[PDB]
């Protein structure tokens, strides 16, 4: 949760 970007 709270991923570092859209790739996640």
């Amino acid at each position, epitope marked *: *949760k709270h991923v570092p970007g*859209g*790739g996640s």
Partner: antibody
């Protein structure tokens, strides 16, 4: 309408800390990320990092680890960026921006920027 | 960390002409599950904050007229401005949001007259 209200220009002395606010309105504060961007006069945009006020979690551009500290206060809908032990390298405009976390991951609304001058 | 390369560094065009500019990423910005490129374009006029123009490589932001068009996919992206107006002079930045965030160095648009 979405709005991010940042504070006016600051003159701060070398070696001190400066903390600047970014007061969000017009949307659910805990549904979006706040990111921070540095711009030296006449130069390009550089990403500092981001905070998700829902969880308090952060990500940073490696360059700014231990220079920038991002926080947020849910009750006031305000995000803060603190710069520690400033030097003339830190003289720049700092923008906050709303990041549409989870869909576009794009900074759709931007504050007016806080101009920091670091000088004795 | 993803490196973003914009070219040309600046461009001069006459009012009414079409301009094209390039943005390349060191890694694919396309995620197969979501099927989106995490690539955005921002316009910054003198003395103003940056403004979002295009996200997901090709989706125009609220209120932005269709003469601004983003295209491309993966590592290769383009911004086209048709019927350039004098009021379009700005620096145009691309920015990846696949993993952390990185701005390209900008393409400066000048007007010929």
């Amino acid at each position: 309408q979405v709005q991010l209200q940042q504070s006016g220009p600051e003159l701060v002395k070398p070696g001190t800390s400066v903390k600047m606010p970014c007061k969000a309105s017009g949307y659910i504060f805990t549904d979006y990320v706040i990111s921070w961007v540095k711009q030296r006069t006449g130069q390009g945009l550089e990403w500092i990092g981001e905070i998700f006020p829902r969880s308090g979690s952060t990500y940073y551009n490696e360059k700014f680890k231990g220079k920038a500290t991002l926080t947020a206060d849910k009750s006031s809908n305000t995000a803060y960026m603190q710069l520690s032990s400033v030097t003339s390298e830190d003289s720049a405009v700092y923008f906050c921006a709303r990041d549409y976390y989870g869909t576009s991951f794009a900074m759709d609304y931007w504050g007016q920027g806080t101009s920091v001058t670091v000088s004795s | 960390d993803i490196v973003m390369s914009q070219s040309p560094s600046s461009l001069a065009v006459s009012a009414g002409e079409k301009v094209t500019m390039s943005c390349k990423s060191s890694q694919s910005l396309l995620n197969s599950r979501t099927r989106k490129n995490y690539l955005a374009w921002y316009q910054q006029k003198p003395g103003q904050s940056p403004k979002l123009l295009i996200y997901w490589a090709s989706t125009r932001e609220s209120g932005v007229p269709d003469r601004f068009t983003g295209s491309g996919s993966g590592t290769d992206f383009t911004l086209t401005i048709s019927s350039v107006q004098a009021e379009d002079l700005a620096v145009y930045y691309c920015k990846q949001s696949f993993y952390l965030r990185t701005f390209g160095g900008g393409t400066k648009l000048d007007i010929k007259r």
